[PDB]
Write a protein that binds this DNA or RNA. Structure first.
Ligand SMILES: [Mg+2]
Ligand SMILES: [Mg+2]
Ligand SMILES: [Mg+2]
Ligand SMILES: [Mg+2]
Ligand SMILES: [Mg+2]
Ligand SMILES: [Mg+2]
Ligand SMILES: [Zn+2]
Lengths: 750, 750
DNA sequence: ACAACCTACTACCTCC
DNA sequence: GGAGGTAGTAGGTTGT
DNA sequence: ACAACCTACTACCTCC
DNA sequence: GGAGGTAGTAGGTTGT
């Protein structure tokens, strides 16, 4: 239970840590220009207080405007984040920058071409204080650029350019490289036809744009020679592309682009299958390759300066060896509770008793009451007409097999409603047609008049447009139908012994997802948690507006052995900042309409990202008024620290906990650890900082196993945060069901 | 039926109309600066095509950048809008500008002080082509500014400044006049306390900000003398105000302001009752004062140039003399249809039979079926605790009188459900407390468990905060309760003969609004319209995000004699542009789920504002695919043309119709006419322009009388546009009710 | 040349 | 969109 | 010094 | 927010 792990950080020399620093207050308006972070960066310092425009500098100020001397302090009187930023700024002053380390790294890893793209290695650096010393954290990445322009890519043909723009519609971006400001633009298509918008009747505007781009930016003879080398002569046979900026606010400013002056932004859609396979084998590196590359880079650094004083550091991590099958309760064939450790199976063999007799019969733990009151549930089969006929018949046969197997294996032991499939419930329509969607909606309303719940199985094409998918799912959710979508590439995965049937793994995942979408919880967790309610919060952007329809919470709650899941919504915000006062007000209203008093209890809040100061003030006001004790955690997924091990473990570094809660089943890649940081306790209006104990890590590890979407995959995030992310994904696309169905479970977003 | 009316436009000289013009194409990026409208204005021209950067100029170009000569054309080959813009640009070139006409106007109307504010007259000009000639339209307005700064307003006292900021919280704006860019800021208060955020412990930052504002902008000795005259010496006893910009996007940039350097933006909240009475008597001018002032101004203009060649023009308008009581059907005391002209009454005596016997008994035309199935409806009385005790008892007594009178007068003749008032249904809570709101919501959920519809009567204070009103109404609408709110200033309006009762006008309006909120249509319209469906569309901004949750439609529909009102929602947009494809798709889905086929019918679309080109393309695609014939109108409320008459009339001017559909009951003010413009017919994918006939004006005038909010007030807008505006007002604040209640009428937003 | 994070998409591999 | 990981691209929010 | 419109708020008066 | 008008203040969207 004590293992030595290797990380990607090195110890720095302590002779670069500054002795004394000065604070300066800058007197200027935001509404003029010359941003305060730029003033701090040009004056070799950092920003402490953005509210009062206070900067910290290890040297004397050389500012041209008005300033005032605030204070003379030491380096140890600062918070640790500002110390890390100051050490990083001094390291960038002393020649240790990201692009110089990229220059050093490219001597051992040459740029590699893949088709029409080029991959170049890259180092990203950070500073972490641990044990009184500062460590430089290095992270390996790659940059994939285009070595050819758009006009030279298609062979200087207009029809090839039209086919390239029409084929990759939806994820095509063009970057202008002939201007001083390299802006990324998106091409504009016809809204109802889909053709690209080009002007192929202007041989004079092309010459005017060519001469304007030549005379405005490339004015020196060396710049003229570089322009004639890079782009060559003017081609008057090329069209003019209509494009908008990728930035949302200047999207109403039309831009005329030349295909000779733009390059395509890299996407993996623009490659074939083979080159995609080699490029994703090349980008994903294992732990040993990263260790060797970082060791070669650090050995190159250490023979040129005296800053790096050590190799890759070895830390101590505590392993997690706990059988999770002891805490997973389920029903047996007689409907009696039992842990899968007593049945000597795992989570992944819940449905193997359907077609075999050498395995115990597993019945679900919880069935909702509304499913018991409901006599029949209609099941519809919607098939896209763009598929081949054998794929259509195979999809209908697999849907009939799936529903019949579920109906037999559930009706032989427990009280389940009848899923009705009729020959008039099967439709084969074109999904990209609006009239077919409208007629299918009319027919499904006329079929589901005297009913409360229905199920649909949709079979789509290989590459359906993203608007059509959201439209079909939203129109099905508005008419009280839970839908499950299977694409064409999924239907090509067959069993190794039976080629005429689907793969059994996909059938079991579809069984579990269909059962979980109607509120059935097959297995629950048995653990007496220290908190009565566990609330997970996540935010997502809105699709059309510049705001946030995302912002929702998922509550795990019970009497003390957590079984119940309820999702609620924050509402609508302007940025990424939850109004906790309104959130807790409708939380108390909803839980009091359930019959539970939310006064004097304990609530554990897991927030995806970082808790802002406005959220802290709202939680303090809620704790002062309603008298609730709140414990908040901060979960971070994307950082630069990497642990070179593939095992369930955790590591205490600085004031954070980096845990690996799963193992990577692939043979390529390094797992990204999860960061727990800034445990806050709010009680009676006062916020205190706490220490992350072993019980919090153990409870988060236990909450990371409550997966209702699949039986063979282990997720990284805890279950309330994961279901909050799926709920804001559902609410972003406009997907909604009735309220009392949301109160009885019914995880329709999984 | 032929009356001569006077307008506010004068004929221009025809020797200023240009002979020939040139077109120029400008080659520059939007992402650099130097906007194309500024290039057109500095080069004495206008912009024709913003897509292709095409400008029109009557003279030769003097541009420094790259340009190309497009074409040489005449003035008569342009559209009329571009001709009006060119004539307006030439008039601003020849000295006829708005501020110079304001200089001319201030000789006859001196600036007038009201308290601490100053009112100055102002002329706004436009150009309208009519009959082959161009007319300059002049519009009278006023500008009210502040003659004193914020520090001199409160008497240079910190407690008076704190009381002034705390009293006018919510509508306080401060403009900085010590900078080159005059930006309007909003002060920042505490989120849960309400106190202003001031720094009264900095005698050094005030001097630094004073010296910085002195040395940055006012650097010349004349500017230093003007700065010392305007602001005087530095006061080090003043605090520093924390403020944000009023512009939404830079609201995260904190600004430190000095109260000596800022002025208060004018609001009528900052005046007493007497000064508000004189200032609104002074701002609202009748027709004769505007005629005399414009005649004096035009007589001053005509003796200085040769451009204006006539006085105020007299046009011909057609009067509307049609008795609207013939087309208003209602039920009698035998439930038999009858027009109020047969009963020899009007719209305004529908409830006078309740307390009198010399008037006929009037029963409503339509009662919804769901009200007939419902046996009982609970009625709650919520009273704010901030009121005085006599006001509380008077509000409860008036609510009991209102419900008892409605119950008796409706139960004696027709089949009405019983409105239940119990002694436990009356609550007296503090509305500004969150815990009282939460407990009231819990109690109302526990009281309305086995019920489908309830009614609430709320009595609030004089000045309730706008967040609390929306919160209370949203929490009542979420628990299936229709609410009606009466404030404290409404309860002080008593009858002239009975001082212990409410005014009978307010009681009748509350009766009609309460009856209309539960789907009861008292009177309908009898007219065979030329269109099967009439759809009104309006948009409103979202509260917190930068987008548009507004965008909704109201459909007036029947078999041909319009009686049924259904509101639907567009969804969520980015700007002011309706996606007509999705709107018509869920329209066909909703009307087919009602059992009506929407193929081959005619739909009249009334849009609040102007129909964009994307809406035109969407309507063309909908008409091509679904085969619907669409007729679109454009309704304009705010323009510069004024008709100096107080009578129902219409006037054909240019290609638009300016109608006065109502009379102003006040003794001050000039009525603003409504503009009908750009009648479009879309059939089989082609959009043609039509002419506004007499039948369209007559049908719009008939639709302008379908008011369900009051019986004594005549609205200007047509009824679908008005109800669309009220529906986006409801959906902006988050107010929503169940679906099948929305399908059965139930105008909850009136 | 402002950092440390967070979304939205595309692609491959691997499970019982 | 069988569900979960890892890779890449482009933007946007928050420090106080 | 870009026009013609559209929101969001505050205030008074007038109805049977 | 009795409902409708007219007055003022500040911003924001669309021309093609
Ligand atoms: Mg997040
Ligand atoms: Mg998320
Ligand atoms: Mg799913
Ligand atoms: Mg509008
Ligand atoms: Mg409106
Ligand atoms: Mg109302
Ligand atoms: Zn925005």
């Amino acid at each position: 239970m004590l293992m030595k792990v290797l990380t990607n950080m090195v110890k720095l020399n302590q002779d670069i840590i500054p002795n004394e620093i000065y604070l300066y207050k800058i007197f200027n308006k935001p509404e003029d220009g010359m941003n305060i972070y730029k003033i701090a960066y040009r004056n070799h310092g950092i920003v402490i207080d953005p509210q009062n425009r206070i900067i910290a500098t290890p040297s004397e100020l050389e500012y041209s405007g008005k300033f005032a001397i605030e204070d003379e302090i030491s380096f140890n009187e600062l918070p640790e984040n500002y110390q890390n930023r100051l050490v990083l700024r001094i390291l960038r002053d002393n020649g240790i920058s990201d692009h110089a380390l990229s220059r050093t790294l490219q001597k051992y890893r040459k740029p590699k071409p893949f088709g029409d793209f080029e991959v170049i290695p890259e180092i990203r650096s950070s500073v972490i204080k641990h044990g009184g010393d500062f460590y430089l954290v290095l992270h390996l990445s790659h940059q994939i650029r285009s070595k050819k322009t758009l006009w030279e890519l298609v062979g200087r043909n207009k029809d090839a350019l039209r086919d390239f723009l029409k084929e990759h519609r939806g994820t095509i971006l063009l970057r202008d490289i002939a201007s001083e400001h390299k802006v990324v633009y998106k091409p504009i298509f016809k809204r109802y036809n889909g053709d690209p918008d080009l002007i192929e009747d202007n041989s004079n505007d092309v010459e005017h744009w060519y001469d304007y781009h030549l005379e405005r930016y490339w004015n020196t003879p060396e710049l003229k020679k570089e322009f004639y080398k890079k782009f060559g002569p003017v081609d008057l046979n090329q069209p003019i592309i209509l494009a908008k900026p990728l930035r949302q606010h200047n999207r109403g400013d039309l831009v005329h682009l030349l295909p000779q002056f733009v390059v395509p932004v890299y996407n993996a859609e623009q490659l074939n299958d083979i080159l995609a396979s080699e490029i994703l084998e090349y980008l994903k590196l294992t732990s040993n390759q990263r260790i060797s590359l970082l060791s070669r880079l650090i050995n190159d650094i250490k023979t040129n300066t005296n800053i790096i004083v050590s190799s890759l550091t070895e830390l101590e991590a505590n392993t997690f060896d706990v059988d999770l099958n002891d805490m997973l309760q389920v029903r047996n064939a007689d409907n009696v509770k039992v842990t899968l450790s007593e049945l000597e199976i795992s989570k992944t063999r819940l449905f193997t008793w359907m077609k075999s007799r050498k395995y115990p019969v597993i019945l679900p733990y919880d069935i909702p009451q509304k499913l018991k009151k409901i006599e029949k549930i209609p099941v519809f089969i919607i098939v896209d007409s763009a598929l081949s006929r054998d794929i259509q018949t195979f999809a209908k046969d697999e849907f009939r097999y799936l529903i019949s197997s579920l109906q037999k294996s559930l009706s032989n032991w427990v009280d389940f409603p009848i899923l009705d499939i009729r020959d008039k419930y099967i439709f084969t329509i074109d999904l990209t047609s609006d009239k077919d969607i409208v007629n299918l909606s009319i027919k499904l309303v006329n079929l589901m008049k005297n009913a409360e719940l229905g199920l649909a199985l949709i079979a789509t094409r290989t590459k359906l447009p993203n608007e059509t998918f959201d439209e079909v799912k939203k129109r099905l959710f508005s008419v009280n139908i839970i839908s499950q979508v299977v694409n064409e590439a999924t239907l090509y995965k067959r069993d190794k012994y039976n080629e005429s049937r689907l793969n059994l793994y996909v059938q079991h995942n579809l069984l579990f997802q269909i059962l979980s979408k109607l509120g059935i919880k097959y297995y629950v967790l048995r653990h007496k948690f220290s908190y009565d309610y566990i609330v997970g919060i996540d935010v997502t952007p809105m699709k059309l507006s510049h705001g946030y329809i995302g912002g929702s919470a998922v509550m795990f709650d019970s009497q003390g052995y957590i079984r119940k899941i309820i999702p609620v919504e924050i509402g609508e915000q302007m940025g990424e900042s939850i109004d906790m006062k309104e959130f807790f007000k409708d939380m108390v209203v909803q839980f009091g309409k359930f019959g539970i008093d939310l006064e004097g209890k304990s609530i554990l809040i897991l927030r995806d990202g970082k808790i802002t100061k406005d959220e802290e003030e709202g939680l303090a006001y809620i704790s002062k008024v309603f008298g609730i004790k709140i414990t908040t955690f901060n979960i971070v997924k994307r950082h630069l620290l990497r642990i070179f091990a593939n095992r369930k473990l955790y590591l205490r570094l600085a004031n954070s906990v980096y845990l690996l809660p799963h193992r990577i089943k692939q043979s390529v890649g390094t797992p990204v650890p999860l960061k727990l940081s800034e445990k806050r306790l709010i009680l009676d209006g006062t916020i205190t900082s706490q220490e992350i104990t072993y019980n919090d890590i153990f409870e988060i590890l236990l909450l990371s196993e409550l997966n209702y979407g699949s039986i063979s995959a282990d997720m990284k995030l805890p279950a309330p945060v994961h279901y909050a992310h799926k709920f804001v994904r559902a609410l972003r696309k406009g997907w909604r069901i009735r309220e009392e169905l949301l109160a009885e479970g019914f995880l329709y977003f999984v």
